[PDB]
Design a protein around this ligand. Structure first.
Ligand code: 27P
Ligand code: YB
Ligand code: YB
Ligand code: YB
Ligand code: ZN
Length: 607
């Protein structure tokens, strides 16, 4: 039972293919067209089925060349409205038919952000991008919007001829639109079956540059050179990921660098990973996000969570592979450093929700929960922690990597649950069942809070971060003189970030301490997004008024939720900035990403 979908389940019928023919209208902010779903009955005498929709206008539904009856049910909040279609002829088990639905999206589509020219780098052309995970594909087109169903797709997209369309698919040519010479039709084919949350579309003034044998970077012209350099390690990471996961099956691995309002670090859309421009640090230091997106090409896109309750399967395993890629490139002490950092982020998330809160469970129950409200670091880091604990229990990283590869092989092209994963774990490790039975499975999988056991972490690279953080926290006024720029001499950017993360966990610090930190370290000068984020949070929580304009600027000039939500929440909690935070949100709300607008509004208690 997928409790996030109103459509007929996979036990009733299954979509095998989508053919999407649509046109992008920037004047109306609508996508208009036809979705032809090839559907296979899983039942005898099948006479109707139900699809998910959200803010879609349906013109007609055509089967065997004739219009058929359909009905849209009442809207069920964030789940949208179920669409029941009456089949003209009853279907036998395994029979396939094609259902062509003519539809139009709403400008308010929660899957889409429509950008005006002034919101882009070039200032001349508008821009459109989608983001369907978890349950927003239904806000683009009618579908069984559940990751328990996998389908191939083809698409033809008409756009203004001056712009470029790209999708999560192999590019299959372009031509002028025979209905309109002011437009072009771009074509696409995705021959590997995918869950519908991986469908993606971008339209804008895009240019490309080759950066490896199977990778182009795409962005607006003004970001192409910087992006090519920032992500130059991509092919080396793909080669490592293939060694760990098995063959890369998707053909191309392209990267799209979105405008700053993209709400996430990355989205693993097949053939075309989407990433935030906040990765453009200038030194490749945020490349773990690329390693993460790469890893999803196996864990998530090949082996897929059957329902969103089991999202940790996607994320825990991807973070586990991510950290192995970074360990291969930069050493095992670095893998441990990042693993221990991840535990810190888990501590933060658990403290934020509360240690008994149901969103801190590894396996969640999303019945009547909007997935976007539950989303956090928990499935990532509690999931990673479980796998890291199992690695240490079962004999180390090379042994556990053997399991990961066998797991990917076993469940490729399938959708699975936590119980499927555990069953296979027990099968693979049959000779170590006695060790597996020592694990507190109920606690790890189904209890809220921090896990019942913390893994063992090498501390080598973390020690200096902790030492400096503790110096600052224990400092009194007469100790402040002792701090100096040379304190940071032997710290990498990763360590500076960890120093700030450690210190932020104990915030507020005294205002005089934070002023001294700026005097001697000049953190205001650093434009690395992760470091600047934590520094500004530290300043605002410690009640430094000078930081108010800096934090408001960062909160609004980009829209990655990891940064924008906590910055607004901190600014709201600071009496001196509270009214500015609310006013700034109100003024920007109409031009924000729809999901980000909703979540910041909820965080600020502004309706
Ligand atoms: C724990 C927390 C949340 C969930 C459900 C969930 C699953 C996927 C979600 O995707 C949100 C959008 N993606 C875009 C790329 C990173 C996040 C959001 C919510 C399950 C377990
Ligand atoms: Yb072709
Ligand atoms: Yb003293
Ligand atoms: Yb209001
Ligand atoms: Zn992920």
């Amino acid at each position: 039972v997928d409790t996030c979908s109103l459509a007929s389940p996979a036990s009733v019928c299954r979509t095998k293919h989508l053919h999407l023919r649509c046109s992008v209208d920037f004047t109306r902010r609508t996508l208009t067209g036809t979705a032809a779903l090839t559907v296979q009955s899983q039942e005898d005498n099948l006479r109707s089925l139900v699809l998910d929709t959200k803010d879609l206008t349906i013109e007609k539904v055509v089967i065997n060349g004739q219009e058929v009856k359909y009905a849209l049910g009442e809207r069920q909040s964030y789940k949208g409205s179920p669409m029941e279609i009456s089949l003209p002829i009853a279907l036998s088990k395994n029979q396939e038919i094609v259902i062509e639905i003519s539809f139009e999206t709403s400008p308010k589509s929660s899957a889409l952000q429509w950008l005006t020219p002034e919101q882009t780098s070039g200032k001349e052309h508008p821009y459109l991008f989608s983001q369907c995970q978890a349950i927003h594909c239904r806000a683009i087109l009618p579908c069984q919007d559940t990751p328990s169903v996998k389908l191939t797709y083809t698409a033809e997209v008409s756009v203004p001829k001056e712009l470029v369309a790209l999708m999560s698919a192999i590019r299959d040519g372009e031509t002028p639109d025979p209905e309109d010479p002011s437009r072009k039709i771009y074509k696409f084919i995705q021959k590997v079956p995918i869950p519908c949350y991986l469908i993606a579309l971008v339209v804008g003034a895009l240019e490309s540059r080759q950066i490896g044998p199977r990778t182009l970077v795409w962005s607006e012209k003004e970001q192409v050179e910087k992006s090519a350099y920032e992500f130059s390690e991509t092919e080396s990471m793909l080669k490592i990921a293939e060694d760990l996961g098995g063959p890369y099956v998707w053909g191309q691995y392209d990267l799209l660098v979105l405008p700053p309002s993209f709400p996430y670090g990355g989205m693993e859309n097949p053939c075309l990973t989407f990433v935030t421009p906040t990765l453009l640090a200038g030194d490749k230091s945020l490349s773990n996000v690329i390693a993460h997106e790469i890893s999803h090409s196996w864990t998530g896109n090949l082996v897929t969570n059957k329902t969103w309750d089991h999202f940790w399967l996607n994320e825990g395993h991807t973070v586990y592979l991510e950290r192995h890629i970074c360990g291969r490139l930069f050493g095992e002490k670095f893998r441990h450093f990042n693993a221990l950092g991840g535990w810190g982020e888990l501590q933060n998330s658990v403290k934020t929700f509360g240690e008994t809160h149901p969103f801190t469970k590894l396996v969640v129950d999303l019945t009547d929960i909007d997935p976007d409200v539950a989303y956090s670091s928990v499935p990532y880091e509690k999931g990673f922690a479980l796998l890291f604990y199992l690695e240490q229990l079962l004999g180390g990283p090379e042994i556990f990597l053997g399991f990961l590869k066998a797991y990917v092989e076993k469940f490729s092209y399938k959708s699975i649950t936590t119980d499927d994963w555990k069953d296979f774990l027990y099968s693979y490790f049959k000779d170590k069942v006695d060790v597996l039975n020592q694990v507190d499975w109920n606690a790890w999988l189904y209890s809220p809070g921090l896990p019942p056991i913390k893994p063992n972490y090498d501390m080598t690279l973390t020690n200096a971060c902790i030492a400096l953080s503790q110096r600052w926290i224990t400092a009194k006024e007469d100790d402040l003189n002792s701090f100096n720029a040379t304190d940071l001499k032997d710290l990498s950017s990763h360590q500076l970030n960890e120093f700030l993360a450690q210190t932020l966990q104990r915030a507020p610090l005294p205002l005089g301490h934070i002023k001294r930190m700026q005097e001697v370290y000049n953190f205001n000068a650093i434009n690395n997004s992760e470091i600047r984020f934590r520094w500004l949070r530290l300043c605002i929580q410690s009640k430094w008024e000078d930081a108010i304009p800096l934090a408001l600027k960062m909160a609004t000039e980009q829209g990655r939720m990891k940064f924008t939500r906590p910055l607004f929440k901190d600014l709201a909690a600071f009496d001196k900035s509270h009214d500015q935070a609310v006013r700034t949100y109100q003024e920007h709300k109409a031009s924000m990403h729809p999901v980000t607008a909703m979540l910041v509004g909820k965080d600020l208690k502004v309706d």
